[PDB]
Amino acid sequence: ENLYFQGHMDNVDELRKIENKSSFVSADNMPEYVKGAFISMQDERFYNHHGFDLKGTTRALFSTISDRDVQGGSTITQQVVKNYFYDNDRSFTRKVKELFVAHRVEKQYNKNEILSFYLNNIYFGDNQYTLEGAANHYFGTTVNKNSTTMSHITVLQSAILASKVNAPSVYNINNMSENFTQRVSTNLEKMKQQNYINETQYQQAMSQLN
Ligand SMILES: C=C(C/C=C(/C)CCC=C(C)C)CCC(C)(C)/C=C/CC/C(C)=C\CO[C@H](COP(=O)(O)O[C@H]1O[C@H](C(N)=O)[C@@](C)(O)[C@H](OC(N)=O)[C@H]1O[C@@H]1O[C@H](CO[C@@H]2O[C@H](CO)[C@@H](O)[C@H](O)[C@H]2O)[C@@H](O[C@@H]2O[C@H](C)[C@@H](O[C@@H]3O[C@H](C(=O)NC4=C(O)C=CC4=O)[C@H](O)[C@H](O)[C@H]3O)[C@H](O)[C@H]2NC(C)=O)[C@H](O)[C@H]1NC(C)=O)C(=O)O
C-alpha cells in the first residue's frame, strides 16, 4: 500500500511528495557503497547518462562478444517513473511512455534527487517502500551514514536489498534460493569492479553470504 506516493505525473514535481515519507533518507545521507549496491546492479553509468544509456548499451552489445557489460532493461530513472505510475500490466506502450517521462525527470532533477526518489519509492517486500524501512525491518540497520544510534547497513545487506527489488515478493532474505544468492554474489562482484567496495569488504561479504 503506497498509493499516495503514486500518480499520473501531470507534473514531475509530484515526485517531491516522496520526501515527506517518515522513513525518507536522502541519497546524500547514505554511504557510497549503499548507493553503489543499487547503481552497480541496476544502472552502472547512472551519473553519466541522461536516463537512457544509449552509448554504453550499444558498446556492451557490439564491442565485445562477452555479455560482461550487458545490463538490465531499465535505467534507475525509468524505474522511478514505472514505480511512480500506478501498478499496471507491463507492455511496450507503458514502457515507451515511461521512457518519455524519464527524459522529463532527467531535465528537471539532478542525479541525487532521482536516486532519492528511487530508493524511497520502490518495493523491497513485506510492505516496505523505502530503503530505510527495508534495512530496519530486515536487519535492524540504517542507511543514514550520520547515525550514532543505529547499526549501519553492511556491504552484504546493501547488495541483498539491491538484488531483492528485481523480485521483492519472491526473493526471500531468511531462506535465500540459489538464484537469489547468485544475484547477490554478482551484485557484490560488480560493487568491487566499480570500486564501491574493496577486496577486504568483498571477501567479508562473500564469507557472510556463504
Ligand atoms: C524501440 C523498440 C525497438 C522495437 C522495434 C520493433 C525495432 C524498431 C526498428 C525499426 C523501426 C527499424 C521497442 C523495444 C523496447 C522500447 C525496449 C520495449 C520493450 C518491451 C518490454 C516489454 C515486453 C514489457 C515492458 O515491461 C518489462 C518488464 O517490466 P517489469 O516486470 O516491471 O520488470 C521486471 O523485469 C525487468 C526485466 N525483465 O528486465 C527488470 C529486471 O528490469 C525489472 O527490474 C527492475 N529493477 O526494475 C523487474 O522489475 C521488478 O519486477 C517485479 C515483478 O517481476 C515480474 O513478476 C511477474 C509475476 O507477476 C513475472 O511474470 C515476471 O517474469 C517478473 O519479471 C516487481 O515485483 C512486484 O512488485 C509489486 C509491488 C508486488 O506487488 C505487491 O505485493 C505485495 C505483497 O504482499 N508482496 C509480498 C511480499 O512482500 C512477501 C510476500 C508477498 O506476496 C502486496 O500484495 C501488494 O498489494 C502488491 O501490490 C509484486 O508482488 C512483485 N512481484 C514479484 C514477482 O516480486 C518489482 O517491483 C520490479 N522492480 C521495480 C524496481 O520495478 C520491462 O520494463 O523490462
Numbering used by the authors: 59 to 268
Show the paper's wording.
The difference map produced by the phenix.polder tool in PHENIX shows for the first time a complete C25 moenocinol lipid tail of MoeADON modelled into the structure. Additional electron density was observed in the groove accommodating ring A of MoeADON which is consistent with a non-ionic surfactant: glyceryl monolaurate used during cell lysis procedure. The polar end of glyceryl monolaurate makes strong hydrogen bond interactions with the side chains of Asp184, Tyr196 and the backbone atoms of Pro226, Ser227, Val228, Tyr229 and Asn230. Our analyses also revealed a large positive electron density extending from the bound phosphate ion at the base of the jaw subdomain (His107 to Leu112), along the external surface, connecting to an additional area of positive electron density at the mouth of a deep pocket just below the catalytic site. This deep pocket is surrounded by the conserved residues in what we now define as motif I (Asp101, His107, Gly109, Asp111), motif II (Gln129, Gly130, Gly131, Ser132, Thr133, Gln136) and motif III (Lys153), suggesting its functional significance. The difference density from the polder map was sufficient to fit the A and B rings of MoeA at the mouth of the deep pocket and ring F connecting the bound phosphate ion at the base of the jaw subdomain. Saccharide rings C, D, E and the C25 moenocinol lipid tail could not be modelled due to a lack of significant difference density. The overall electron density suggested that sections of a second MoeA molecule (i.e. MoeAJAW) bound to the jaw subdomain could be modelled at this site. The ring B of MoeAJAW forms hydrogen bonds with the side chains of Asp101, Gln136, the backbone carbonyl oxygen atom of Phe110 and the water molecules in the pocket.
